[PDB]
Amino acid sequence: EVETFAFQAEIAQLMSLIINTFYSNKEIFLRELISNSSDALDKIRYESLTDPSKLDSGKELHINLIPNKQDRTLTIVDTGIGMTKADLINNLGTIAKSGTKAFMEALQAGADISMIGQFGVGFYSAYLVAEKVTVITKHNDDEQYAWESSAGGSFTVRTDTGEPMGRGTKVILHLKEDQTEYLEERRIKEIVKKHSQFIGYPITLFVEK
Ligand SMILES: Cc1ccc(C(N)=O)cc1C
C-alpha cells in the first residue's frame, strides 16, 4: 500500500531550483544532512533526561555514513528521535513552506545555496547530488515508514517492510551518475572534517570491500 502525495507548490519550486541552478559547491549537502541528524539526536537525548525508557529502542546515539558503490548510494544513518508518518508527510518535520519563502528572498538578495540550512530546509540540498532520495524512519510513537521522492512534484509514503531500525532515520541518496565522488572514502572524510568537525556525536564512515 503506497500513498502518493503532491509537494506543496513552494516546496516543488525549492526542489526545482536546487536541481536546475548552476552551483558547483554541491558538497554542502552532507553537512546539512549531518546537522539534521545531530538535531534529531539532541531531541531524543533531551527526552531521555526525564524518561529513560525513551531509549529502550536503542541507547546508542550516533551517525553512520555508508557508501555503496554497487548500488550507487550514500546512506546517512542516525539513531535520533525519528519521524512519525505525520511528520514525514508534513515536509519531514520542518516548516518548509515558510523556510522556503525566507530562503528564496535571501537568494534574490545575494545569498547562495550553501546557506540553505539557516532556513530550516537543508534536507532538500540532497537533490544537489541525488536523483532519488529514500528516507526510512522509526519514531517511538509510530511504525517504521519509508518516504521517497525523485522530485517531479510528488513523494510517496509506505510502511517499511525492510530491516527494522529500532529508532532513528536513514537517508538513502541514490546519487546522480556524475556525483559518484561522494562514495569515495577520502572525499567523504574531507567533507566531514571541513564542515562537521564540531558535531557532538560519533560519525563513523563505513568502508567497502
Ligand atoms: C528534514 C529532516 C530529515 C531527516 C531528519 C532526521 N535525521 O531525523 C530530520 C529532518 C528535519
UniProtKB/Swiss-Prot annotation:
Any Gene Ontology CC annotation: melanosome
Keywords for this protein: Acetylation, ATP-binding, Cell membrane, Chaperone, Cytoplasm, Host-virus interaction, Hydrolase, Membrane, Mitochondrion, Nucleotide-binding, Nucleus, Phosphoprotein, S-nitrosylation, Stress response, Ubl conjugation
Annotated region described as Interaction with NR3C1, given as residue ranges: 1-209
ATP-binding keyword on record: yes
Modified residues annotated as N6-acetyllysine in this record: 43, 69
Keyword Isomerase belongs to the record: no
Subcellular locations according to the entry: Nucleus; Cytoplasm; Melanosome; Cell membrane
Predominant location: nucleus
PTM text: ISGylated. S-nitrosylated; negatively regulates the ATPase activity and the activation of eNOS by HSP90AA1.
Binding site for ATP: 36, 78, 97, 123
GO molecular function: ATP binding; ATP hydrolysis activity; ATP-dependent protein folding chaperone; CTP binding; dATP binding; disordered domain specific binding; DNA polymerase binding; enzyme-substrate adaptor activity
Effect the entry attributes to changing residue 32 to A: Strong ATP-binding. Strong interaction with HSF1, HIF1A, ERBB2, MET, KEAP1 and RHOBTB2. No effect on interaction with TSC1
Gene Ontology terms: biological process: activation of innate immune response; cardiac muscle cell apoptotic process; cellular response to heat; cellular response to virus; chaperone-mediated autophagy; chaperone-mediated protein complex assembly; mitochondrial transport; neurofibrillary tangle assembly
Assembly, per entry: Homodimer. Identified in NR3C1/GCR steroid receptor-chaperone complexes formed at least by NR3C1, HSP90AA1 and a variety of proteins containing TPR repeats such as FKBP4, FKBP5, PPID, PPP5C or STIP1. Forms a complex containing HSP90AA1, TSC1 and TSC2; TSC1 is required to recruit TCS2 to the complex. The closed form interacts (via the middle domain and TPR repeat-binding motif) with co-chaperone TSC1 (via C-terminus). Interacts with TOM34. Interacts with TERT; the interaction, together with PTGES3, is required for correct assembly and stabilization of the TERT holoenzyme complex.
Biological role: Molecular chaperone that promotes the maturation, structural maintenance and proper regulation of specific target proteins involved for instance in cell cycle control and signal transduction. Undergoes a functional cycle that is linked to its ATPase activity which is essential for its chaperone activity. This cycle probably induces conformational changes in the client proteins, thereby causing their activation. Interacts dynamically with various co-chaperones that modulate its substrate recognition, ATPase cycle and chaperone function.
Name this polypeptide is given: Heat shock protein HSP 90-alpha
Organism: Homo sapiens
High-level lineage: Eukaryota, Metazoa, Chordata, Craniata, Vertebrata
Residue window of the full protein shown: 16 to 224 of 732
